[PDB]
């Protein structure tokens, strides 16, 4: 149980839900367990814009905050989606096959799976240098897998930040990189329907598309 209420760059912290669309778990710190819900995208059944949009240079690392620290086992993953030219980010929900993955977490494989996200209160998110400047949504998710051996038991903790990415390049992620939310995930996916406990897995297939790099 945690939210992802903040993102920041190089000018101190922001306020909760200042640059992050207020997630529907803002009171209970709970999860989405329905990969078919609109909430799987930005945790909003009713779209509501963030108060502001954060300017960040492509190729730099910003910070996505959690509250309180992440403590369920499983991966952090981050996706970007570029708002079309002529559309206002405040109004854009990010529907269709527009999301590309820029990070996913692999566990360390030992007697148990250990996750570097354990105990972390924030995460560095490296924005690709080569993507086109524009307005973007940055989707954060943590997937808690402690009881995920049953369908519908994986716990998704999600939010989305509004960014203005500057100083871009000209690389467009391929069609194979871009997915929709809902759409990208199925309840049967091997990194969602999974017993991480015993026997311990010796590999882990993150859900969603390949990580896009320049
Ligand atoms: Cu919890």
Author numbering: 1 to 214
Please give me the paper's original passages concerning this structure:
An oxidative system was recently discovered in which extracellular flavocytochromes, that is, cellobiose dehydrogenases (CDHs), cooperate with copper-dependent lytic polysaccharide monooxygenases (LPMOs)8910111213 to catalyse redox-mediated glycosidic bond cleavage in crystalline cellulose, hemicelluloses and starch. CDHs are large flavocytochromes containing a haem b-binding cytochrome domain (CYT) connected by a long, flexible linker to a flavin adenine dinucleotide (FAD)-binding dehydrogenase domain (DH). The DH domain oxidizes cellobiose at the C1 position to cellobiono-1,5-lactone with reduction of FAD. The ensuing step involves inter-domain electron transfer (IET) from the reduced FAD to CYT haem b, presumably by single electron-transfer (ET) events, followed by ET from CYT to external electron acceptors such as LPMOs.
NcLPMO9F primarily attacks crystalline cellulose and promotes, in combination with cellulases, faster and more complete surface degradation. The structure of NcLPMO9F demonstrates that this LPMO shares the essential features of fungal LPMOs, including a β-sandwich fold and a catalytic surface-exposed copper centre in which the copper is coordinated by the ligands His1, His72 and Tyr157. We determined that NcLPMO9F is expressed in Pichia pastoris as a 214-residue non-glycosylated protein. As observed for the fungal LPMO GH61D from Phanerochaete chrysosporium, the N-terminal histidine in NcLPMO9F is not methylated, in contrast to the methylation of other N. crassa LPMOs expressed using the natural fungal host1523. Both NCS molecules in the NcLPMO9F crystal have copper ligated by four protein atoms in tetrahedral coordination and exhibit distorted octahedral coordination of the copper with mer-[MA3B3] geometry together with external ligands. In molecule A, two water molecules, one axial and one equatorial, satisfy the octahedral sphere. In molecule B, both water molecules are replaced by the carboxylate oxygen atoms of Asp33 from molecule A, which is similar to the coordination sphere observed in Streptomyces coelicolor ScLPMO10B where two oxygen atoms in an acetate molecule occupy the fourth equatorial and axial position on the solvent-facing side of Cu(II)34. These observations emphasize the possibility of the 4-coordinate Cu(II) in NcLPMO9F to accept one axial, and possibly also a fourth equatorial ligand (water or other). We observed very rapid NcCYT-to-NcLPMO9F ET with a haem b-kobs value of 67.2±2.3 s–1. Our results demonstrate unequivocally that, in the N. crassa CDH IIA-LPMO9F pair, the reduced haem b alone acts as the reductant of the NcLPMO9F copper centre in vitro.
